[PDB]
Design a protein around this nucleic acid. Sequence first.
RNA 1: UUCACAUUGCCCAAGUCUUU
RNA 2: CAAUGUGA
Length: 803
Amino acid sequence: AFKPPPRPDFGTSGRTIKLQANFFEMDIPKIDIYHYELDIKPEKCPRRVNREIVEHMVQHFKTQIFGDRKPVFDGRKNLYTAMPLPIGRDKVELEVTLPIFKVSIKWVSCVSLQALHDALSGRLPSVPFETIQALDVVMRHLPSMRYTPVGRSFFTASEGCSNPLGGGREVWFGFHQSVRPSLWKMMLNIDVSATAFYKAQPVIEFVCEVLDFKSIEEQQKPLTDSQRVKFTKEIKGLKVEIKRKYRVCNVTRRPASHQTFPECTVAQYFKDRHKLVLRYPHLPCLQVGQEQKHTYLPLEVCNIVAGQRCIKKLTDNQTSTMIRATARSAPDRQEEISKLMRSADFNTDPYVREFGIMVKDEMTDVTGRVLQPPSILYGGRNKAIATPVQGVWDMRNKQFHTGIEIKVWAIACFAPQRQCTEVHLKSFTEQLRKISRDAGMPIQGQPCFCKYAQGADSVEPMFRHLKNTYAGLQLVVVILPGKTPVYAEVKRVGDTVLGMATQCVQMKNVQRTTPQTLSNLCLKINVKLGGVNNILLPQGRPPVFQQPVIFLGADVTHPPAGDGKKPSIAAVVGSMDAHPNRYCATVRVQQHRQEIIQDLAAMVRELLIQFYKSTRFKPTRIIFYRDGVSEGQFQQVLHHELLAIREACIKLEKDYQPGITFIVVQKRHHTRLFCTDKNERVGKSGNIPAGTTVDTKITHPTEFDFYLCSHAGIQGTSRPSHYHVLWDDNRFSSDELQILTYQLCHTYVRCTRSVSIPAPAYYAHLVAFRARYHLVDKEGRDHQALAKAVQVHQDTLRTMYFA
RNA sequence: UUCACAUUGCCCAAGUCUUU
RNA sequence: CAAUGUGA
Ligand SMILES: [Mg+2]
Ligand SMILES: [Mg+2]
Ligand SMILES: [Mg+2]
């Protein structure tokens, strides 16, 4: 229940493709290096201040201690040198003055780089984390002081240009950096990125950008409360400088001319003490420091401090500008990374040099294989087979494997009759019925009910009327004007209060229909009503299907940046047939920002019970695709969640012990793959083709992991999903697990495309997002209330309501 | 709220200090 | 999922 399995073999399936990865090979010396523990008092200092302290300390005490030695430092408590310091094992207390600190330096160990080499060649069974940590500190040392660290990235203002976003914000470009072991060598993983920062500009200019002034001379008088409040929202919490740096905690209500402190005015204080006559005395002051004290700075003497990341959500226009500034095709992204590596020149970093490290300036070459897609079987008379090409197929001249006959359905139009007229509704209905008949999901007649309504209050009484009036009602089609709170109310009432299938459609897609939008709509309707859109070609499936097996997908979704109290949402879905096509869902609220799925045992039990009810088989294997767990959480998550799956089995039946395969899926990581050969680039975005698989060179030196880019890249640079097998009772070969994973990406019911993660994992995201919708403005008695909100109706429990 | 892909928002990571 | 783009 602990150590991940070794890689069983390497995959052999599929034609080869030449790739380049944004991994840059490192040459690491084979010497010991030294680790010292540092303590700085006071210790409440920001990491960057600590780095400054240790910098001043090293230069100052070079005589006593650091002769020709260039230490690296993590900004907390860890210091490394390439040669021993003349300290012994003895602690030393050092006094360092910073333009006032006590610093103790105590040795703690020797880190062997030889051992890391041995572990990379699979001699040693495991990778020494602390050694990789040391190398990371070496590589981060100088950029952490030169640039602004954000996460594992570094950002700086661009030289020679500006990317304003408006509102006092601008784009900064930067790069991700991390050190990774691989089958080949140590690798430096580098990617480019961009994020929003506040412009270092005078606060007066900041005010102008936020209140949409061309100049401040526009604002004759004091600000309106409306303006002053808008300004306060934007600058509160930001750092400003006058030498002195300060955080802003408020904006005064009174202008500097009449704002007073004990008792004297602000404008008069600066006249007398600093011999300064304010322009703009009609403007308010920033309050800074302790909000309980009374330190006020006129706007005119303040600059926004450089290098503060913007944490607040961008406006829609700012987002537009950001996308426009940063979107790149895959070849353009590849060239940006390569260009950055040639300019970064890691090898003349004197700390990199001190530690004898070399970094290749060219991307690693790696060979991929492009897996063949499964064939897709449809139904009706013809039982048509679709063949995916470059990640896509379509349903033209095909009928659903099992299509639902729709006999009783209603329309509720919450869009205004003046815009979405009865003629629109009639036309939409005629076109929908045509497409549905072609798909083998015949809508046998007109709806039983078609009415206009307005506002969230009308939803529940209408739906109760419908449920009570129309026996055999299968579907309510709900037309919505655009973004509206009515949508969340429809899903509260449908999914959780009354247990009724609903399909919402925006008015614009009723007013003007296309065959492709209507066809996609039918994919969802058939699914919601219990149909089987299509199945993997049965004889083309891997051998795991010869015995009963259940596929689980699991995700936790965390609340947005800055949020302090909302729950995290855990979702787990399980397959319910042998195809595998149909799924049931479970969902829970749990502790804020907890990744481990707390109630997983109960959720899996529910799904196992429903699987047996649906198939009359007990799974001999459980294949668990777990989304979104980072490497630094693998052991904690595996420990709880593998045992929770076992617990669900044991409590169902004594000696019921199906084999478990536990696979982490990670869409968001920093590995990018590019075609080496221009003639392999697919489409306008120039990405690798769907089915591109990598399990050599850049993957783990001992464990069982692979990249699989299962989808067609439409825009930008494709994220190749990564799969790490943390447990495998079933002893899959690489080929069989890779092919299984790819085939499951072709079972997602909402589109005739291979998607970027397996259908079970994708459904878990949809379930979590629907629960978030059930919680809008609602997020022990507390836990109970949130838990009630996400519990679907008894009649919804067994459905694919989340599609 | 037709759908996918892509950017950001999500665990790990990162971040958080003292004269008006 | 939401904001924004690219597409079918
Ligand atoms: Mg997640
Ligand atoms: Mg943390
Ligand atoms: Mg969107």
